[PDB]
Design a protein around this ligand. Structure first.
Ligand SMILES: O=c1ccn([C@@H]2O[C@H](COP(=O)(O)OP(=O)(O)OP(=O)(O)O)[C@@H](O)[C@H]2O)c(=O)[nH]1
Ligand SMILES: O=c1ccn([C@@H]2O[C@H](COP(=O)(O)OP(=O)(O)OP(=O)(O)O)[C@@H](O)[C@H]2O)c(=O)[nH]1
Length: 326
């Protein structure tokens, strides 16, 4: 077993959050927001003179892909759900349709809010982000998400279940488990070292897509027993170095200088750069902290003392990274 593998697996155990199918609590919080939309829509459509539209819900995001992490103390769960309304996208404005859902949830928890890509409702210790889609069968065979706010706004081609399939299918078995561990590690790093400025933080979706493009398994197969051991430290070092290698200096005509930018395309529609909202200064800070993480992964490998190796990693992963006593 590689040095520090035991402590990576212990760290993983402490940061992992059980996915929808293994987590009764998340399923119940999800279903309650779903019920409140159904109840809420009757009331919105009472002023319309016809039944509220039917919708089909589906799991989205980290809790659907088994890449979920516990928030830091006083952080929030992010429950992602898709609802496909039984409507023709050409019959309705996307902000109009998001309004139905916001107004539906006006009286649920602390409030409801139309965002660029979802309706978000707030409750004690978590939010539910509802992605709102039109019916493909009524919309010319495309699944489209309702994009835009009052301050803008279209039906954008979307493929959340294709993205979910891509993450599930890249690898299998214990290879796929390492891939998922390494996404979770970077999400905890994100939470620990980008707490000062939430806005500057790389999105979980961006770390996940980066892993889809660039993650490689690190394992060894004993030449005697063929017993297999994983090396998460090494897989992370190769992955972080590959991400660093894909930053490009990008000219900014306003500032008259370049900023390093990492472009990470979603591998399904709409194939957008998931990091496009990050500013050049945020990208420079992202790159510098990634390089500092890479340097710690390399220092960990060479330390005489397991204590010193684990301390070097704890400095980037936070208080759940085990540090054995010297
Ligand atoms: O830029 C984006 C963001 C989100 N999405 C779609 O919405 C889903 C929810 O996007 P989230 O931003 O909630 O990401 P996540 O759940 O995968 O990551 P963490 O919260 O664990 O940090 C994503 O998993 C993807 O399907 C996009 O297609 N593009
Ligand atoms: O394709 C997408 C994009 C986003 N989403 C879902 O929408 C959530 C919010 O994504 P938004 O795109 O609505 O955030 P925003 O730009 O409004 O952010 P601020 O104005 O507050 O800075 C994401 O976390 C994800 O759950 C999807 O489900 N699919």
């Amino acid at each position: 077993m590689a040095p520090v593998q035991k402590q990576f697996r212990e760290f993983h155990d402490r940061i992992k959050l059980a996915q929808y199918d293994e987590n009764q609590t998340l399923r119940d919080e999800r279903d309650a927001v779903l019920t409140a939309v159904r109840e809420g829509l009757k009331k919105v459509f009472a002023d319309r003179g016809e039944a509220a539209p039917t919708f089909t819900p589906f799991n989205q995001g980290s809790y659907a892909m088994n890449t979920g992490v516990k928030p830091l103390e006083g952080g929030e769960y992010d429950i992602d759900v898709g609802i496909i309304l039984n409507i023709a996208k050409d019959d309705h404005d996307p902000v109009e349709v998001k309004k139905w859902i916001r107004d539906a949830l006006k009286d649920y928890g602390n409030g409801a809010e139309i965002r660029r890509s979802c309706v978000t409702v707030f409750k004690p210790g978590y939010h539910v982000d509802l992605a709102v889609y039109a019916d493909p069968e009524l919309s010319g065979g495309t699944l489209c998400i309702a994009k835009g706010k009052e301050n803008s706004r279209l039906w954008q081609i979307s493929d959340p279940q294709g993205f979910q399939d891509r993450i599930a299918s890249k690898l299998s078995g214990d290879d796929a488990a390492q891939f998922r561990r390494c996404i979770r590690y970077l999400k905890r790093w994100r939470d620990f070292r980008f707490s000062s400025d939430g806005n500057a933080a790389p999105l979980g979706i961006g770390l996940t897509a980066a892993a889809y493009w660039w993650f490689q398994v690190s394992k060894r197969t004993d030449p005697v027993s063929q017993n297999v051991t994983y090396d998460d430290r090494d897989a992370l070092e190769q992955f972080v170095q590959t991400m660093l290698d894909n930053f490009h200096d990008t000219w900014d005509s306003k500032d008259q200088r370049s900023y390093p930018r990492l472009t990470v395309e979603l591998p399904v529609q709409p194939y957008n750069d998931v990091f496009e909202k990050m500013t050049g200064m945020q990208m420079e800070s992202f790159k510098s902290k990634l390089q500092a993480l890479l340097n710690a992964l390399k220092t960990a490998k060479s330390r005489l003392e397991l204590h010193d190796a684990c301390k070097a990693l704890a400095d980037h992963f936070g208080s759940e990274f085990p540090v054995p006593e010297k």
